CSV table of C-alpha atoms and ligand atoms in Angstrom, one decimal:
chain,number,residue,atom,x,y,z
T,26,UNK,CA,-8.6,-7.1,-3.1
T,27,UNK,CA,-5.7,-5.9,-5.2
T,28,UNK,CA,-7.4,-3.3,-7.1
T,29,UNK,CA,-9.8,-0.6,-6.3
T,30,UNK,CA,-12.7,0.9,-8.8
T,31,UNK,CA,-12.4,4.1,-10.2
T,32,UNK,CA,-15.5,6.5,-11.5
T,33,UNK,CA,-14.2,5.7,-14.9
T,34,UNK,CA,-15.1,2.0,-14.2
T,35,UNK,CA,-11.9,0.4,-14.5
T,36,UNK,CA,-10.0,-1.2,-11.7
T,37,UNK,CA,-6.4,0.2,-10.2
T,38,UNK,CA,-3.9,-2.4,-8.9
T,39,UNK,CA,-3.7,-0.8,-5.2
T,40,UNK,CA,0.3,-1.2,-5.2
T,41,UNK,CA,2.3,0.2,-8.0
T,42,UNK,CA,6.0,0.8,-8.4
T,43,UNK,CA,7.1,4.9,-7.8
T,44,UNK,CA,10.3,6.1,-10.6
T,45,UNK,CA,11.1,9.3,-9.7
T,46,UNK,CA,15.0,9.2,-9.2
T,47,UNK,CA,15.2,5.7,-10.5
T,48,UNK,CA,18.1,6.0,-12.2
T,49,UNK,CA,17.8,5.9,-16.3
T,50,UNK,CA,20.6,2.9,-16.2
T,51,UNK,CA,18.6,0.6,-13.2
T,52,UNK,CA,14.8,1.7,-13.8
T,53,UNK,CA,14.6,-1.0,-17.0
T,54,UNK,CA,15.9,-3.9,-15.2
T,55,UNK,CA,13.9,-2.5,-12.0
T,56,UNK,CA,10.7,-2.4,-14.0
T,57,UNK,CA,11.6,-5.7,-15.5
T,58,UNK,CA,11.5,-7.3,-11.4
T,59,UNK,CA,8.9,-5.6,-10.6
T,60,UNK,CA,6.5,-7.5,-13.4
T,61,UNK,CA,8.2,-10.6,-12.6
T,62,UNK,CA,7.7,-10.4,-9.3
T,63,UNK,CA,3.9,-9.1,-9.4
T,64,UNK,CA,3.2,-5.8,-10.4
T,65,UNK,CA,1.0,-4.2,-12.7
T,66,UNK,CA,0.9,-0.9,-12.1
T,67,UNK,CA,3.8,1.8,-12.9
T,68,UNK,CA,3.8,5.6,-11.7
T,69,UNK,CA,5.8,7.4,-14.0
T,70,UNK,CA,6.0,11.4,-15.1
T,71,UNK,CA,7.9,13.1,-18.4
T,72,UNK,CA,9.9,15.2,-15.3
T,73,UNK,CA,11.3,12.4,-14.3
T,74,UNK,CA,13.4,11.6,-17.7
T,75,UNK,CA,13.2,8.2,-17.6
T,76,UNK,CA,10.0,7.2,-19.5
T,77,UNK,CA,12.2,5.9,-21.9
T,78,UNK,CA,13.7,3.5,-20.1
T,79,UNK,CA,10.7,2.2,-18.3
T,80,UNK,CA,9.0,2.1,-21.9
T,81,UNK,CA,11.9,-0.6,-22.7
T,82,UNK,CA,11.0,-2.8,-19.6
T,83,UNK,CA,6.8,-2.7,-20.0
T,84,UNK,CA,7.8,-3.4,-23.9
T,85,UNK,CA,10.0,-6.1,-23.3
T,86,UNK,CA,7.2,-8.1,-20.8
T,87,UNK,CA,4.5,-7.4,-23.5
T,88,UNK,CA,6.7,-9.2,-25.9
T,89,UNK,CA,8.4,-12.0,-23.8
T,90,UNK,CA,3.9,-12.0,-22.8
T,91,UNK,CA,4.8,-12.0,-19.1
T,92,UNK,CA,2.4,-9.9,-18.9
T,93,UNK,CA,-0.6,-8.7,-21.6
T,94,UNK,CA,-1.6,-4.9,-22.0
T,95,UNK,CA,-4.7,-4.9,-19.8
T,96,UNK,CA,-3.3,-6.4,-17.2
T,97,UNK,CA,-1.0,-3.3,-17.1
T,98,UNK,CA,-2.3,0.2,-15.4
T,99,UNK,CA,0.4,3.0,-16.4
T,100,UNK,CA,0.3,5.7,-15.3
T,101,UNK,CA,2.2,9.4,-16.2
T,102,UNK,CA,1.9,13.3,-15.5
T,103,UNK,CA,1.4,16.3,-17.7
T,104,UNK,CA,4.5,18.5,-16.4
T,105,UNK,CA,3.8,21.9,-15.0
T,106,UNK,CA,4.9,23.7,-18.6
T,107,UNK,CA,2.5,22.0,-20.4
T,108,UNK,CA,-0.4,23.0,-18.8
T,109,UNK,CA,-1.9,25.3,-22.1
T,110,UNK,CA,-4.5,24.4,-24.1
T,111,UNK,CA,-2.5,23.6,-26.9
T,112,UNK,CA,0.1,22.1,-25.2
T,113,UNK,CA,-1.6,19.4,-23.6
T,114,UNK,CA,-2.0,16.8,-26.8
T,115,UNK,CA,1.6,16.6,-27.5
T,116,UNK,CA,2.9,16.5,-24.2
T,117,UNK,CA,0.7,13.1,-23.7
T,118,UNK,CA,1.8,11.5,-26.7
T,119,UNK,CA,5.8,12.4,-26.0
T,120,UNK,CA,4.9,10.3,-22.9
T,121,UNK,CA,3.2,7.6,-25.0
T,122,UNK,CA,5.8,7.9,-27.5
T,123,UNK,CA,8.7,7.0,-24.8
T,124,UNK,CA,6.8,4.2,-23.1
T,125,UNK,CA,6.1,2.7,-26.4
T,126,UNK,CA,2.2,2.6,-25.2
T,127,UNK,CA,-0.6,3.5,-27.4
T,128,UNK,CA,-2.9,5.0,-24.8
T,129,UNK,CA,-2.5,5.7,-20.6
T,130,UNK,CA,-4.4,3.9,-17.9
T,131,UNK,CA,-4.5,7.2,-16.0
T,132,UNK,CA,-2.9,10.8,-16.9
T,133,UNK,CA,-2.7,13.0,-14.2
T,134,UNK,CA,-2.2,16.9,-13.8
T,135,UNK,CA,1.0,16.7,-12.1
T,136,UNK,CA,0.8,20.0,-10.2
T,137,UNK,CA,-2.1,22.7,-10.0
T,138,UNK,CA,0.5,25.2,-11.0
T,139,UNK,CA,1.0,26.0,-14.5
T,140,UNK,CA,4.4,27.5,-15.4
T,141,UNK,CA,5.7,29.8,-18.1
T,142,UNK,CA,6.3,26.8,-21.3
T,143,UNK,CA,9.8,26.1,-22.7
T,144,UNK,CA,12.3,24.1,-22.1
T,145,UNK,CA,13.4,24.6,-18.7
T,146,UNK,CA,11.2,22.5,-16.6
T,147,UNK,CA,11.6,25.1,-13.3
T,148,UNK,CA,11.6,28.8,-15.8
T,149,UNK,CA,13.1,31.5,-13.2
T,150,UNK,CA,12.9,35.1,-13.1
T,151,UNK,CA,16.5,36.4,-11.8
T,152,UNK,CA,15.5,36.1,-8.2
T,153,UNK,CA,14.7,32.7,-8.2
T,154,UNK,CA,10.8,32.6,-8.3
T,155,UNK,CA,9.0,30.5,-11.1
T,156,UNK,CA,7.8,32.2,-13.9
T,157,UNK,CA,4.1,31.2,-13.4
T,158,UNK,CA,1.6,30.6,-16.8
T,159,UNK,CA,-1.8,32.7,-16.7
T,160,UNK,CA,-3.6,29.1,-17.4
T,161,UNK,CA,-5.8,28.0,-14.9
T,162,UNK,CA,-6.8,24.6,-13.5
T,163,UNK,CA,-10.2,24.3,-15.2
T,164,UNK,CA,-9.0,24.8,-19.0
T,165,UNK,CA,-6.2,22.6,-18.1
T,166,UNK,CA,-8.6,20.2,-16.9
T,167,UNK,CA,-10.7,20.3,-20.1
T,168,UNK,CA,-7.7,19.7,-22.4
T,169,UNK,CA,-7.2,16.5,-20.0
T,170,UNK,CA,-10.7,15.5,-20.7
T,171,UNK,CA,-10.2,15.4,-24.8
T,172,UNK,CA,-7.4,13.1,-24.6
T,173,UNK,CA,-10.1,10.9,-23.0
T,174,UNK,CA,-12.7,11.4,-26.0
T,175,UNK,CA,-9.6,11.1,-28.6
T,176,UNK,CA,-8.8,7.8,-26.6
T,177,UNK,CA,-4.9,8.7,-26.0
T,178,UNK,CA,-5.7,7.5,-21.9
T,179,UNK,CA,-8.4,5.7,-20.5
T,180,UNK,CA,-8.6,8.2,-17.0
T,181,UNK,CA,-7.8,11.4,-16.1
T,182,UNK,CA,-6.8,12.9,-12.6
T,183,UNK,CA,-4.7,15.0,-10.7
T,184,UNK,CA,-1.8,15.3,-8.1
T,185,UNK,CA,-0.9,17.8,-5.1
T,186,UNK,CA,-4.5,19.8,-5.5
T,187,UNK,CA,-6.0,20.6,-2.3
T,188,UNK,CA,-9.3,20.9,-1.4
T,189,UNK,CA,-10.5,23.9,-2.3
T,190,UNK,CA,-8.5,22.7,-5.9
T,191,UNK,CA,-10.5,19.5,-5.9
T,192,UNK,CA,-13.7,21.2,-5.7
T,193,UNK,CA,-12.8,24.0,-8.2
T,194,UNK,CA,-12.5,21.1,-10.5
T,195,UNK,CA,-16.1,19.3,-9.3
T,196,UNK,CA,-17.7,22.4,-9.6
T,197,UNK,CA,-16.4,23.6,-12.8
T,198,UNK,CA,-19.4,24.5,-15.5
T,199,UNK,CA,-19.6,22.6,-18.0
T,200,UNK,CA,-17.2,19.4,-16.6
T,201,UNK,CA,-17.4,16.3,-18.7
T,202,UNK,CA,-15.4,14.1,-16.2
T,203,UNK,CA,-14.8,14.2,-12.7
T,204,UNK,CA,-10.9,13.4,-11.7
T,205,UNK,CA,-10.7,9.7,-11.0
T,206,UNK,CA,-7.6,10.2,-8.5
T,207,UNK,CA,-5.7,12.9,-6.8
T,208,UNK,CA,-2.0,11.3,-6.0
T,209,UNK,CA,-0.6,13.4,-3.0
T,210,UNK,CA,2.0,12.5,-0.5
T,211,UNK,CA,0.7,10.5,2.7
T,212,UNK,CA,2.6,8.7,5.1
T,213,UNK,CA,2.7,8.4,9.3
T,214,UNK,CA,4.1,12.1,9.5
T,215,UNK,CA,2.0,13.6,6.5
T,216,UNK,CA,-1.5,12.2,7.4
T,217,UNK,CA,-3.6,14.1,5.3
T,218,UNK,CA,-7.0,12.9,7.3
T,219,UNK,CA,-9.4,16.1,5.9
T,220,UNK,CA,-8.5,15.6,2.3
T,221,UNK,CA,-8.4,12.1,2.5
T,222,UNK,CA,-11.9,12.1,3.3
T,223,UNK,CA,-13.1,14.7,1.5
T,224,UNK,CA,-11.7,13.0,-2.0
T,225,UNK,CA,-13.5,9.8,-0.8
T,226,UNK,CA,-16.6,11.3,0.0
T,227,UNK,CA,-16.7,12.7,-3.6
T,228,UNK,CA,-16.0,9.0,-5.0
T,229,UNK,CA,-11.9,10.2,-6.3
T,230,UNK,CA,-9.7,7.6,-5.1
T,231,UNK,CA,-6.4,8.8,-3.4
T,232,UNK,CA,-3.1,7.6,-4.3
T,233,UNK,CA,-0.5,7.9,-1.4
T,234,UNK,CA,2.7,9.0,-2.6
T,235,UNK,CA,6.5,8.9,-0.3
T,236,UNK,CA,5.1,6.5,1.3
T,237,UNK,CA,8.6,5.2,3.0
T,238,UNK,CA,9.2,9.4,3.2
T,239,UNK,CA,11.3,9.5,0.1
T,240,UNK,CA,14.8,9.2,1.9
T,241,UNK,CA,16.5,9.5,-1.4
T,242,UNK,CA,15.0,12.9,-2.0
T,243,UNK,CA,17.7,15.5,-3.3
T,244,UNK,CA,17.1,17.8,-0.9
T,245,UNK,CA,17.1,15.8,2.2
T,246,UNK,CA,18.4,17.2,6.1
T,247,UNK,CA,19.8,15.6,8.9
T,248,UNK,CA,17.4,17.7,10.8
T,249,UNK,CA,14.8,15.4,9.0
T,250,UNK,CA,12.4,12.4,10.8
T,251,UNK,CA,12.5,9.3,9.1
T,252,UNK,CA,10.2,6.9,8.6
T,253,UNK,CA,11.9,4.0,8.3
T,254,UNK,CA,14.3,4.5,11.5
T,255,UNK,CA,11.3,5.6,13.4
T,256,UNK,CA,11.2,3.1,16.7
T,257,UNK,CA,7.8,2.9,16.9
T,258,UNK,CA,7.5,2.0,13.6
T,259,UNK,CA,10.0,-0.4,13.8
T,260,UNK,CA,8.0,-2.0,17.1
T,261,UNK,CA,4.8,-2.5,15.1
T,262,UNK,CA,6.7,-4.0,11.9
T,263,UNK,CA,9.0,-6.6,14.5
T,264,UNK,CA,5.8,-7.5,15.9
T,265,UNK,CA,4.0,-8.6,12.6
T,266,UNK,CA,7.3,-10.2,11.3
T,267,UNK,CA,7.3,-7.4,8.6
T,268,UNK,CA,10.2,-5.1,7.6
T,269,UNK,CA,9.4,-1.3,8.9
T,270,UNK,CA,8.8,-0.5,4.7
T,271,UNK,CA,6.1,-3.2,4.5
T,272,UNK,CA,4.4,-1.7,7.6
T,273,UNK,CA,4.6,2.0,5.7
T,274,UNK,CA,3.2,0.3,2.6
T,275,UNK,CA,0.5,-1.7,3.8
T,276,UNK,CA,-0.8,1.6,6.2
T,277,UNK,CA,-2.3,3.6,3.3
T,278,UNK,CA,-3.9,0.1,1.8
T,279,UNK,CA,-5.8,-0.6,4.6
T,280,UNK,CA,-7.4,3.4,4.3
T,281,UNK,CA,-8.5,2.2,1.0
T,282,UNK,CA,-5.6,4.0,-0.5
T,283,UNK,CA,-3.5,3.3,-3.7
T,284,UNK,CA,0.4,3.3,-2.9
T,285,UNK,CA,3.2,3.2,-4.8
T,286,UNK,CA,7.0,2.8,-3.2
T,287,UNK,CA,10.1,3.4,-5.2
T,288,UNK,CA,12.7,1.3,-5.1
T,289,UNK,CA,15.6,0.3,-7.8
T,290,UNK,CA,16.9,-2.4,-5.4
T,291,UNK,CA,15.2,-6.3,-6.5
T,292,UNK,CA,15.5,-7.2,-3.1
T,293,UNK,CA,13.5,-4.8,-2.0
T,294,UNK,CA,11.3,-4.5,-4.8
T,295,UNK,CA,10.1,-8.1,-4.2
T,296,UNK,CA,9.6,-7.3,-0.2
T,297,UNK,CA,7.6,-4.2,-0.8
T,298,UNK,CA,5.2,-6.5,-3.1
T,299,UNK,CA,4.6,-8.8,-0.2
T,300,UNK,CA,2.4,-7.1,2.1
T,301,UNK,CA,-0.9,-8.5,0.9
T,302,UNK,CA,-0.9,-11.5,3.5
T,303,UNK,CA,-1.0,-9.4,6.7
T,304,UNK,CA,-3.0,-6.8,8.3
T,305,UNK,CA,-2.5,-3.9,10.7
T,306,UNK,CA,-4.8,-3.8,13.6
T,307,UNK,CA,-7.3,-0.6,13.9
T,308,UNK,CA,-5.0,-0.2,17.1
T,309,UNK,CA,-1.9,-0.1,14.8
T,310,UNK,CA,-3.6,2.2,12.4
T,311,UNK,CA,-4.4,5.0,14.8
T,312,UNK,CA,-1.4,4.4,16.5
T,313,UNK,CA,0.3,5.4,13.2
T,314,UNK,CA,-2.1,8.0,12.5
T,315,UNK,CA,-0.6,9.4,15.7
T,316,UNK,CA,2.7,10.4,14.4
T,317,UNK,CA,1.5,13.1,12.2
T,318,UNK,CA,3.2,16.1,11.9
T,319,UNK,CA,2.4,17.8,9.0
T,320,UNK,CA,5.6,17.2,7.6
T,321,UNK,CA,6.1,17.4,4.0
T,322,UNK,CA,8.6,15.6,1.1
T,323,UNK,CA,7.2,17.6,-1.7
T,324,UNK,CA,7.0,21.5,-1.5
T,325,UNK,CA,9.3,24.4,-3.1
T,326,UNK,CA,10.1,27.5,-2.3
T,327,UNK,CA,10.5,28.6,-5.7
T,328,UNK,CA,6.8,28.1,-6.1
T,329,UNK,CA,5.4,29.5,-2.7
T,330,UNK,CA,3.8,32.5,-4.6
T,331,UNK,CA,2.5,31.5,-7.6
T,332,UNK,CA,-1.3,31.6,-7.1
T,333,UNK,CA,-2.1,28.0,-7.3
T,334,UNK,CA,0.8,27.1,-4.7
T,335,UNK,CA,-1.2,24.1,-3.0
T,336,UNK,CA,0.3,24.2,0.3
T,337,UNK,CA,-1.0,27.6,2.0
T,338,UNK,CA,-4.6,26.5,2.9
T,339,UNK,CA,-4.9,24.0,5.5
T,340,UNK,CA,-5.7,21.3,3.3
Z,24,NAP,N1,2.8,13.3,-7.8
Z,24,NAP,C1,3.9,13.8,-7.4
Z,24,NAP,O1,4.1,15.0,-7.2
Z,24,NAP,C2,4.9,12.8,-6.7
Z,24,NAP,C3,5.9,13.3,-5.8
Z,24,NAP,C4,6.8,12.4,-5.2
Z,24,NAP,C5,6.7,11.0,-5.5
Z,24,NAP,N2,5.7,10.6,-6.5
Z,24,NAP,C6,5.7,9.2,-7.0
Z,24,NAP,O2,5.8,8.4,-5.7
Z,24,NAP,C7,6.9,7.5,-5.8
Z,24,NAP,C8,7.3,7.1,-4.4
Z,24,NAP,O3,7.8,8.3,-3.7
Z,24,NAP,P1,9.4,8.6,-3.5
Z,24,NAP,O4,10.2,8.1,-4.7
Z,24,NAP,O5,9.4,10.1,-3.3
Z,24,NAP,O6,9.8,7.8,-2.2
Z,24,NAP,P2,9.5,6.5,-1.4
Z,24,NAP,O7,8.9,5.5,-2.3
Z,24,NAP,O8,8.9,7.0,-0.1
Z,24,NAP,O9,11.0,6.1,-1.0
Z,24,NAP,C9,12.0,5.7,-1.9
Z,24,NAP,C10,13.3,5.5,-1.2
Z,24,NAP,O10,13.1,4.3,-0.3
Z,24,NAP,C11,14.0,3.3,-0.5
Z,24,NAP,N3,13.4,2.0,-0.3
Z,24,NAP,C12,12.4,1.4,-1.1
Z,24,NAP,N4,12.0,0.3,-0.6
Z,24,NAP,C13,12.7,0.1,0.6
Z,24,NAP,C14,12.7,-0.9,1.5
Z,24,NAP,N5,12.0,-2.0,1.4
Z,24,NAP,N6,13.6,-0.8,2.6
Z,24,NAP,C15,14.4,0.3,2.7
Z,24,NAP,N7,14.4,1.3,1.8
Z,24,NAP,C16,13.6,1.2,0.7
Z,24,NAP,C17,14.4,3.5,-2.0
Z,24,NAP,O11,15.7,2.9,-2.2
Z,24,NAP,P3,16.2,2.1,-3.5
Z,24,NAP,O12,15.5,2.7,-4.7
Z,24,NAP,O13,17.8,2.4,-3.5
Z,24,NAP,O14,16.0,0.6,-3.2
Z,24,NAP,C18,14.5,5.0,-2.1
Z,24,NAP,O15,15.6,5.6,-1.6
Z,24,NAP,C19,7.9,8.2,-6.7
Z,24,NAP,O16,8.9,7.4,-7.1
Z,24,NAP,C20,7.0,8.8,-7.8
Z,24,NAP,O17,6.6,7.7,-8.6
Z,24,NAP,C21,4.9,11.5,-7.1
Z,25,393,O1,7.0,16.3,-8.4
Z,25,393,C1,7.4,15.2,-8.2
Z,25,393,O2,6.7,14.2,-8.7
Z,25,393,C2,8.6,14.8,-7.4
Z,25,393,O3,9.4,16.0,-7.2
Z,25,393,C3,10.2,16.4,-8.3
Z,25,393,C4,10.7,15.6,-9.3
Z,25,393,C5,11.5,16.1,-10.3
Z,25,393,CL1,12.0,15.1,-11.5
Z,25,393,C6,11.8,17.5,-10.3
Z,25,393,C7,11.3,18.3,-9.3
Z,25,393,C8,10.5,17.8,-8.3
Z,25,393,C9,9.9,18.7,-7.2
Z,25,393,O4,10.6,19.6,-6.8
Z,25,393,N1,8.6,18.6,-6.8
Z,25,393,C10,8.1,19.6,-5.9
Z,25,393,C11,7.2,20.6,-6.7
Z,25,393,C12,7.1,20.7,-8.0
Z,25,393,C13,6.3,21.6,-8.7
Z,25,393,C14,5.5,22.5,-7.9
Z,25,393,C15,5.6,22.4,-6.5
Z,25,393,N2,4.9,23.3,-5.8
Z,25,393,O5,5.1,23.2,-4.6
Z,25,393,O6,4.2,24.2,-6.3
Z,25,393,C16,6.4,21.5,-5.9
């Protein structure tokens, strides 16, 4: 299939196309592929500054009707200074506003950790640590659950909570709706088998971010693995007659995962579509599985003492 049903009762289109460092002057004509070639689901996020410019491509395929509204599942973040209560609202429609939408297919809580609001998107103290805010997941959570009932987004979610996060949020008095995804980072180094499971088991779909291992990531080391030069990877993808990328995308598919590769490249945008006519043996899965090592894209060290830091617990 090429979407999956969430606990809000809509469907999610199981491959979307990722934005963050898509460049403001390539992410329209990206976006713009992208629908030609197939998609129908974006990942974007305010943080990311380019909402604008994706806005332009989803508008123009609406009105050239390559595409109609519903067929569309976009999705966006509430940043990390917007997590108070009366924050919340205006922060959504700023997104809505930029991608010329009048409601969201799915609104996430981008990270667990509030921080102090302004308009530095990272607010330091003089030595470098975030300035946390004294807002906490669960009133965050019910400001995400009013822009349901005032029909600004059709789903709500979150991204980079852990488990103990997660079920803060199931067990939270009074909760109107559960989150219909968490969105983490998972790819042949970064596993994530326990929470994987655990979100599944509580019917919240999973959406595998990096999934290539974000080689364009600003802070990237030559100390680094990489995916996508990774031999054994490369063995499994020569032996389907699939690039190495098409073998990282179509791994967290077959564990009934969402996925959603960047790319600004058409070439590549087109190839990382065409991954629904193969499959991966069970072999090749737990071969893959194998690789883990706990190795993570998206952490900061800025952040590792702010109380909702997800990234001390196990998982
Ligand atoms: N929730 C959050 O905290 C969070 C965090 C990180 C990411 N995400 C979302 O997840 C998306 C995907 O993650 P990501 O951007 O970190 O990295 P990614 O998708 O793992 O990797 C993107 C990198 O791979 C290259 N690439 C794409 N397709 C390729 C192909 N077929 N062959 C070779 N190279 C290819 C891209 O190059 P070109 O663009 O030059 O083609 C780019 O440098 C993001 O864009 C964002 O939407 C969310
Ligand atoms: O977050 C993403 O979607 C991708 O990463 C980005 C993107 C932009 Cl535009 C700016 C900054 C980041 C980034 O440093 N994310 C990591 C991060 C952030 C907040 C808290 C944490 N944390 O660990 O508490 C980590």
């Amino acid at each position: 299939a090429s979407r999956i049903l969430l606990n809000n009762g809509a469907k999610m289109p199981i491959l979307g196309l990722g934005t963050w460092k898509s460049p403001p002057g390539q992410v329209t004509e990206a976006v713009k592929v992208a629908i030609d070639v197939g998609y129908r689901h974006i990942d974007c996020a305010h943080v990311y500054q380019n909402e604008n410019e994706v806005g332009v491509a989803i508008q123009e395929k609406l009105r050239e009707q390559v595409v109609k509204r519903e067929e569309l599942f976009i999705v966006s973040k509430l940043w990390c200074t917007y997590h108070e209560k009366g924050l919340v609202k205006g922060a959504c429609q700023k997104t809505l506003s930029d991608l010329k939408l009048d409601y969201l297919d799915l609104y996430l809580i981008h990270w667990p950790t509030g921080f102090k609001p302004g308009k530095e998107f990272f607010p330091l103290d003089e030595s470098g640590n975030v300035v946390p805010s004294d807002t906490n997941i669960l009133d965050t959570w019910a400001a995400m659950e009013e822009l349901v009932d005032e029909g600004l987004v059709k789903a709500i979610g979150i991204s980079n909570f852990n488990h103990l996060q997660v079920e803060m949020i199931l067990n939270k008095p009074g909760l109107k709706y559960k989150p219909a995804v968490n969105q983490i980072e998972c790819h042949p180094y970064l596993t994530q088998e326990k929470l994987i499971q655990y979100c599944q088991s509580k019917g919240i779909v999973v959406t595998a971010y990096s999934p290539l291992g974000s080689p364009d990531r600003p802070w990237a080391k030559p100390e680094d693995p990489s995916l996508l030069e990774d031999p054994r990877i490369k063995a499994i993808a020569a032996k389907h007659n699939k690039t190495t990328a098409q073998v990282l995308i179509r791994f967290p598919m077959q564990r009934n995962l969402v996925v959603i590769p960047k790319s600004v490249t058409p070439e590549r945008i087109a190839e990382n579509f065409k991954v629904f006519d193969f499959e991966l043996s069970s072999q090749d899965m737990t071969t893959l599985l194998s690789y883990n090592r706990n190795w993570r894209v998206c952490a900061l060290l800025s952040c590792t003492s702010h109380k909702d830091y997800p990234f001390h617990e196990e998982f």
